[PDB]
CSV table of C-alpha atoms (C1' of nucleotides) in Angstrom, one decimal:
chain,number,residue,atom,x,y,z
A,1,UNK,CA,13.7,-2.8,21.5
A,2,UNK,CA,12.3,0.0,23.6
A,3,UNK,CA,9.2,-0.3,26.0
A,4,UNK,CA,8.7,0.9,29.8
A,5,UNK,CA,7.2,0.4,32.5
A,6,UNK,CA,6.5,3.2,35.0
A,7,UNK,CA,9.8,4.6,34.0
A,8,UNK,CA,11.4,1.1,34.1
A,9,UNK,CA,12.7,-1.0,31.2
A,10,UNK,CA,11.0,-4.3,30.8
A,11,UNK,CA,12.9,-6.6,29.2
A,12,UNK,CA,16.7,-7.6,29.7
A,13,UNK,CA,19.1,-8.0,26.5
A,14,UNK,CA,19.0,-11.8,26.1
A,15,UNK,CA,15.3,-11.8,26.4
A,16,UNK,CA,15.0,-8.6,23.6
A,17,UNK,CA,17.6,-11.4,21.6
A,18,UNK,CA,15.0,-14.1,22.3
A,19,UNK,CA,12.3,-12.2,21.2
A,20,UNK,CA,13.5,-10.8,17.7
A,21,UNK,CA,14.6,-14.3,17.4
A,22,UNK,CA,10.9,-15.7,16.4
A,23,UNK,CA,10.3,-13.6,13.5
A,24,UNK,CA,10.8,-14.6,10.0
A,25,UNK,CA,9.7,-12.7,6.7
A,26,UNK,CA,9.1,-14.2,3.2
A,27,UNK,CA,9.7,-12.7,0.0
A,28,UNK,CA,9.6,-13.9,-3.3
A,29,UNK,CA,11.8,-16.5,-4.9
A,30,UNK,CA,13.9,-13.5,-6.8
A,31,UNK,CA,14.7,-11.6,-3.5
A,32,UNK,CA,15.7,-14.8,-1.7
A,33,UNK,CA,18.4,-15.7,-3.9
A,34,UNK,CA,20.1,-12.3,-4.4
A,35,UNK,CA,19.8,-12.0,-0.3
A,36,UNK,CA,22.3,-14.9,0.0
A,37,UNK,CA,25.9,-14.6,-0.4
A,38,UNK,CA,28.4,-16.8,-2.2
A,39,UNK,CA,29.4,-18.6,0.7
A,40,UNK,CA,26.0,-19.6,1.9
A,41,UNK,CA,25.4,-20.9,-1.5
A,42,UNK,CA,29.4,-22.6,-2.0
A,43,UNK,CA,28.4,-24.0,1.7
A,44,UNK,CA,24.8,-25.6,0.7
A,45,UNK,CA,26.5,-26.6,-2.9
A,46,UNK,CA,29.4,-28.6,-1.4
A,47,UNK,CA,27.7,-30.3,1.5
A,48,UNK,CA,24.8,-31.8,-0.8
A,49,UNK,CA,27.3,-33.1,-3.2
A,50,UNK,CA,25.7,-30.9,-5.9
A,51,UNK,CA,29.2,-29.4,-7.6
A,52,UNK,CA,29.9,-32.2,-9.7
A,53,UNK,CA,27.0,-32.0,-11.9
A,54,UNK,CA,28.1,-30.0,-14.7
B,1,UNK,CA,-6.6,27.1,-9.0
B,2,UNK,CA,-7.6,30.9,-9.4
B,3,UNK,CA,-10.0,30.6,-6.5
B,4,UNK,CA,-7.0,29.5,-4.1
B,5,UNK,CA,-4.9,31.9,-5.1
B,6,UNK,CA,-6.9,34.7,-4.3
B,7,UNK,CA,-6.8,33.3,-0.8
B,8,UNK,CA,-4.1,35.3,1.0
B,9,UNK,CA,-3.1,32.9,4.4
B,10,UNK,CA,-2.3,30.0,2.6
B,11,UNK,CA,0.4,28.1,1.7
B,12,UNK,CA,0.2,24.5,0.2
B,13,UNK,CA,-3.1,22.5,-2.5
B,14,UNK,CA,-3.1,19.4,-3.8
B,15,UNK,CA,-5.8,18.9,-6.2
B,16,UNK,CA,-7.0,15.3,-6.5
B,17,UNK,CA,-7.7,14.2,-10.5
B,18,UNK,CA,-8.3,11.6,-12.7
B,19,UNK,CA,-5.5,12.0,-15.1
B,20,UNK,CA,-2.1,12.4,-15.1
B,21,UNK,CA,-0.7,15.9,-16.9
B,22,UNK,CA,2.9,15.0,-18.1
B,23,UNK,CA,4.8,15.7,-21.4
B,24,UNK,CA,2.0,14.1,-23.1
B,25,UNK,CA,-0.2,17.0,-21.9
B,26,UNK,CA,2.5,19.5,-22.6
B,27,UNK,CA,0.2,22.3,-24.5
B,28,UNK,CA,-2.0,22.2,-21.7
B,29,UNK,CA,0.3,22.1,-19.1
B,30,UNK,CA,1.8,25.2,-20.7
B,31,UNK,CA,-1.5,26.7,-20.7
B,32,UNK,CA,-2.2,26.5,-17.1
B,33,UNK,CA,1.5,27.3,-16.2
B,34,UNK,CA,1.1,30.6,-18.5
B,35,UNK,CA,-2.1,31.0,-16.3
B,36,UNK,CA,-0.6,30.8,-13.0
B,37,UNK,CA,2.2,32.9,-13.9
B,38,UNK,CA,-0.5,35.6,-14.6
B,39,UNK,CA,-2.7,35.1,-12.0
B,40,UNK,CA,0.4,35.6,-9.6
B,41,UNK,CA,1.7,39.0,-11.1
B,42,UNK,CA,-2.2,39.9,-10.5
B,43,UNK,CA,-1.5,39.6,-6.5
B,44,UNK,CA,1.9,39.9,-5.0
B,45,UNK,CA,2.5,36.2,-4.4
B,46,UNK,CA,5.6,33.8,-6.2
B,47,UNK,CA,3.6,30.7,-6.3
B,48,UNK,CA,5.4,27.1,-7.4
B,49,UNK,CA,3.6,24.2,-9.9
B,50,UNK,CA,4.6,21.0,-9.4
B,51,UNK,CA,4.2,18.8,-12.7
B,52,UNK,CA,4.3,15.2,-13.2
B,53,UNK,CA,3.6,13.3,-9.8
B,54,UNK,CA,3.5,9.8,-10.4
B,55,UNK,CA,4.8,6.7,-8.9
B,56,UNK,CA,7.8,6.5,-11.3
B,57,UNK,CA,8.6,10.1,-10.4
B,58,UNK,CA,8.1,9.6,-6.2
B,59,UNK,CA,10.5,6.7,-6.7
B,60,UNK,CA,13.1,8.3,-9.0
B,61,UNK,CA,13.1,11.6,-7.7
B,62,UNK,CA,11.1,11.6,-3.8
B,63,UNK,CA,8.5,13.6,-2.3
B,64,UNK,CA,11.0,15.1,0.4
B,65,UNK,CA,11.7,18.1,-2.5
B,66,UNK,CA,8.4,19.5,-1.6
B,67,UNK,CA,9.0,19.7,1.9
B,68,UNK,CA,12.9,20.9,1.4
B,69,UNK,CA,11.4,23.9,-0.7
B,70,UNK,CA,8.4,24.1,1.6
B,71,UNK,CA,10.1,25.0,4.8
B,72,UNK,CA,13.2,26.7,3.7
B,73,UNK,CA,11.7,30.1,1.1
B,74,UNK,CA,8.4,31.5,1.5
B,75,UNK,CA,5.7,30.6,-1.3
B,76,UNK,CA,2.9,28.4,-2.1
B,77,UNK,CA,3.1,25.0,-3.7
B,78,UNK,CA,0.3,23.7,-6.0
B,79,UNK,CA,0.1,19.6,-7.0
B,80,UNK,CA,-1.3,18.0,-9.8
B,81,UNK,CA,-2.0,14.2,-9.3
B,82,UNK,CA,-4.5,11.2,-9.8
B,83,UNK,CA,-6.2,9.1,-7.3
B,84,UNK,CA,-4.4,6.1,-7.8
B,85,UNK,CA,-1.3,7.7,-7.7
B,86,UNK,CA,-1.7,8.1,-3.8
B,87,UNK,CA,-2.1,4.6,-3.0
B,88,UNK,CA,1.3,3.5,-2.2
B,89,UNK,CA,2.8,6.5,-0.6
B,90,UNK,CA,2.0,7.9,2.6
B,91,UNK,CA,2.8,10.1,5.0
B,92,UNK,CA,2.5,13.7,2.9
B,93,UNK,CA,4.2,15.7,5.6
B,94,UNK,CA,6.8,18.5,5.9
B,95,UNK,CA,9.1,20.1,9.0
B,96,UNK,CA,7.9,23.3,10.2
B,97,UNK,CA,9.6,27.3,9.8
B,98,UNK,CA,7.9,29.3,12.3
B,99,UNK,CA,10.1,32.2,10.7
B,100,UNK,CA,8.1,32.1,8.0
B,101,UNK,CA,4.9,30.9,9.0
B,102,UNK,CA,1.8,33.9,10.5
B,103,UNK,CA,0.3,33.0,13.4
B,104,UNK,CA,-2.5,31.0,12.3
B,105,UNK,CA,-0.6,27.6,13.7
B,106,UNK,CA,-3.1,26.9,16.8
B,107,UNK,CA,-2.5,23.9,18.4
B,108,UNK,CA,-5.2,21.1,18.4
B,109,UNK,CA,-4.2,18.9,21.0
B,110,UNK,CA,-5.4,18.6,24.4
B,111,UNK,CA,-2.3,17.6,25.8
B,112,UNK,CA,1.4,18.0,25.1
B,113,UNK,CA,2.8,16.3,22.1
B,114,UNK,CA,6.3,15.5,22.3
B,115,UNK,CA,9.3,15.4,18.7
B,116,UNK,CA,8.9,18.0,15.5
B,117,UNK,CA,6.4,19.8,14.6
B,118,UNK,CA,4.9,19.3,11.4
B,119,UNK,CA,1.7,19.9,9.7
B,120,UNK,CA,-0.5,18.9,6.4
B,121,UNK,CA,-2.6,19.9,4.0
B,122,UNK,CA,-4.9,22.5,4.0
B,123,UNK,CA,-6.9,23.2,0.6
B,124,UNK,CA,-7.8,20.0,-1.0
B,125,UNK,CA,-9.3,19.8,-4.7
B,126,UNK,CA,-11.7,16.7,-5.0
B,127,UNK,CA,-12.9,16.0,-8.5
B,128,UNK,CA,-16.0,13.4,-9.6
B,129,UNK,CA,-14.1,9.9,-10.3
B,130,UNK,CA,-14.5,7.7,-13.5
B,131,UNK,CA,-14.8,4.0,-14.6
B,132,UNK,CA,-15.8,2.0,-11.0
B,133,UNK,CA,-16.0,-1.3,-13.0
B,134,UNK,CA,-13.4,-3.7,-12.6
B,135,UNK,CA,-11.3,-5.2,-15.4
B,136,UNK,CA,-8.2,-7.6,-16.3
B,137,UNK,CA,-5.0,-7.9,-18.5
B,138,UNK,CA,-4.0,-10.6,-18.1
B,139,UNK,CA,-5.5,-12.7,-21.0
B,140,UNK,CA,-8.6,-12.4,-23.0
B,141,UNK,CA,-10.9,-15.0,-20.7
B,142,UNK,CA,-10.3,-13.4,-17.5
B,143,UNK,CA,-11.9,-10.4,-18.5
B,144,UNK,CA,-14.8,-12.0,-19.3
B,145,UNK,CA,-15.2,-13.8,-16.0
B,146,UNK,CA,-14.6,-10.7,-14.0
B,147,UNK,CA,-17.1,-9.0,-15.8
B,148,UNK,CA,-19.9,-12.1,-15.8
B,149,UNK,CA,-19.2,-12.2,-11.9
B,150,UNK,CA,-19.7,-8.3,-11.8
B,151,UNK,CA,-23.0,-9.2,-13.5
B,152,UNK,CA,-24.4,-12.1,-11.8
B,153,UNK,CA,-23.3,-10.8,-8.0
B,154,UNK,CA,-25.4,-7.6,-9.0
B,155,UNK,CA,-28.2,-9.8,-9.6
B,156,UNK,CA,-28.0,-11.5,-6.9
B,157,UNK,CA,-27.5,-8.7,-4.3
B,158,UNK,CA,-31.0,-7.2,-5.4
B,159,UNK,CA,-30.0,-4.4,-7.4
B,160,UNK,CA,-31.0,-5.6,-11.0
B,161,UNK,CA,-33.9,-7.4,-12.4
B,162,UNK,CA,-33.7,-10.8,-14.1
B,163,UNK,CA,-34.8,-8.8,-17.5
B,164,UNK,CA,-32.3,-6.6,-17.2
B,165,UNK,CA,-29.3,-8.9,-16.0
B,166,UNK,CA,-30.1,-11.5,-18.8
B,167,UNK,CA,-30.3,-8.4,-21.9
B,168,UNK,CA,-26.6,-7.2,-20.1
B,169,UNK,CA,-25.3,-10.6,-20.1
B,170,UNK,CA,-26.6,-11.2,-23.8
B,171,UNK,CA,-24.8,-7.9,-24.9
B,172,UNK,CA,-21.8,-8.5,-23.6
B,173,UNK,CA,-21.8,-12.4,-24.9
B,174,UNK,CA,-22.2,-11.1,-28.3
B,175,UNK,CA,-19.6,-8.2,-28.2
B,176,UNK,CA,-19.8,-4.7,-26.3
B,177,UNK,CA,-17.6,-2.2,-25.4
B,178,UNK,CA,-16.7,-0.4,-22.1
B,179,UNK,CA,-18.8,2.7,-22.6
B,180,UNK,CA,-22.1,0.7,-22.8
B,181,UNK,CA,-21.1,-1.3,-20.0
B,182,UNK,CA,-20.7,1.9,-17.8
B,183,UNK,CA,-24.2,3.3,-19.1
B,184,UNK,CA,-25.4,-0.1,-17.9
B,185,UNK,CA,-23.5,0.1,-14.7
B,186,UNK,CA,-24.3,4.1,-13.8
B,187,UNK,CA,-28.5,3.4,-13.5
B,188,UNK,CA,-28.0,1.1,-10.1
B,189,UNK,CA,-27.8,2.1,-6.4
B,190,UNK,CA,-23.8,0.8,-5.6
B,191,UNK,CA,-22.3,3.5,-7.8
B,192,UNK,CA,-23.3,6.4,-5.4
B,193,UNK,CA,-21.9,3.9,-2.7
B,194,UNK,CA,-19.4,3.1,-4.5
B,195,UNK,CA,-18.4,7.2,-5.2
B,196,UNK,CA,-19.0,7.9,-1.7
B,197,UNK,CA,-16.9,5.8,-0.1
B,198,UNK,CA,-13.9,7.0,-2.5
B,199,UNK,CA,-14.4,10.5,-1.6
B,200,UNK,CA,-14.3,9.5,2.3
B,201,UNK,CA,-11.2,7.9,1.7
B,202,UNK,CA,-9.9,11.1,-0.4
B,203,UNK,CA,-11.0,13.2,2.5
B,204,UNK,CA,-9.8,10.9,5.3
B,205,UNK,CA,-5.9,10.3,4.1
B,206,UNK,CA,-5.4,13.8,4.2
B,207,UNK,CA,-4.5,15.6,7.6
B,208,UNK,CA,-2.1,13.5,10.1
B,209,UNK,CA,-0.9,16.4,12.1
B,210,UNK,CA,-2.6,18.8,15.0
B,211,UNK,CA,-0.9,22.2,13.1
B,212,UNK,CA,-4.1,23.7,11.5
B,213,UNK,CA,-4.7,26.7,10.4
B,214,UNK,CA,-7.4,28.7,10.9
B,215,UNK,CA,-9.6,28.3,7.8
B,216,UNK,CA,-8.9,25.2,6.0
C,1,DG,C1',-23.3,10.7,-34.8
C,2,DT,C1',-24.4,7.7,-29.4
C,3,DG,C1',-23.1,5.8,-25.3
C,4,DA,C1',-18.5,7.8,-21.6
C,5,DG,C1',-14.0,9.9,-21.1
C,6,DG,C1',-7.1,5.4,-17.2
C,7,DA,C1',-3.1,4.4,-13.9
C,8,DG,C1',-1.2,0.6,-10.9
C,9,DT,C1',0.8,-4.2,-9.0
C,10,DC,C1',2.3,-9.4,-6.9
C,11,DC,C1',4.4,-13.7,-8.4
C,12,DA,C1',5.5,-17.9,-11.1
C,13,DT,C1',7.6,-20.3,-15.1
C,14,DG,C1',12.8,-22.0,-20.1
DNA sequence: GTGAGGAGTCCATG
């Protein structure tokens, strides 16, 4: 987010969005799960055809 | 402790132990307290004991209380705590009170610094560790393997002789408990090593800032 | 008595 050169930003806004764009982090299978919401999960649910099992 | 308190110019201790003095070790904690309090009316100091630093308590309570009541009433702050215990929290710093402070602050740095300033320890209390031999709970197997690797990777290294690593191996086959194990493991050349490079660490983890006094 | 002398943690599975 912040870095200069010779008293002269170096990188413009969409390239800072490119950049923190190519990161990912992995936690554990417990964290995962109670980082998503409900409609991420009503979302993945509906469009695998997965709310009809009981 | 009765050695640092007799040192006037000084202001915060944290003495390293093997142990950790809580409820359990109330009477004793007691004792030392009672001590304290005496050894303070002896000079003209108000001194303040900090009991019970563990990783439950730095995540329940925080370490910032030490630096709220370090920088905002003048005293000295004594703190108990194990080595262990200072393996997952870092950074021991505090803000500064040049109010209170002398002027035994001298800069370190060559050059400016820029932000707060802040400082660290300055009497540290380093005491001989205990068990350096590895163990498991997880089952009743693992243990075993850890400690026949232990075993056969001291062989192997140079530091035992075949007599020696087969009568070990043989005792612990058979049933043994940890205190021969540790006579066994004391008489080699990696526990000096071993003690040496856990007192650097000790040593080295402490001091982060370029505020030091003048004796430390 | 005879050796020595204890807290701390990551993740997967019904």
């Amino acid at each position: 987010e912040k870095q200069t050169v010779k008293g002269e930003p170096r990188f413009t806004l969409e390239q800072q969005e490119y950049l923190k764009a190519q990161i990912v982090h992995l936690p554990n299978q417990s964290e995962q799960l109670l980082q998503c919401s409900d409609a991420v999960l009503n979302d993945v649910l509906i469009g695998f055809n997965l709310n009809a099992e009981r | 402790i009765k050695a640092f308190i007799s040192s006037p110019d000084n202001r915060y201790m944290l003495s390293l132990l093997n142990r950790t003095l809580d409820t359990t070790r109330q009477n004793i904690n007691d004792f030392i307290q009672f001590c304290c309090d005496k050894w303070a009316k002896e000079f003209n100091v108000k001194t303040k004991t900090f009991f019970g630093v563990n990783a439950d308590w730095m995540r329940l309570v925080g370490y910032d209380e030490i630096s709220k009541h370090l920088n905002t009433e003048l005293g000295k702050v004594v703190v108990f705590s194990t080595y262990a215990s200072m393996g997952a929290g870092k950074n021991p710093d505090y803000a500064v009170n040049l109010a209170l402070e002398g002027e035994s602050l001298i800069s370190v740095a060559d050059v400016t610094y820029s932000t707060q300033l802040r400082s660290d320890i300055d009497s540290i209390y380093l005491e001989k560790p205990t068990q350096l031999l590895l163990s498991d709970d997880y089952s009743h197997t693992a243990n075993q393997l850890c400690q026949f690797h232990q075993i056969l990777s001291l062989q192997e290294n140079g530091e035992l002789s075949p007599k020696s690593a087969e009568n070990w191996c043989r005792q612990q086959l058979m049933g043994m408990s940890r205190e021969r194990s540790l006579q066994q493991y004391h008489q080699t050349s990696d526990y000096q090593s071993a003690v040496r490079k856990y007192i650097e660490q000790a040593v080295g983890r402490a001091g982060r800032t370029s505020l030091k006094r003048k004796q430390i």
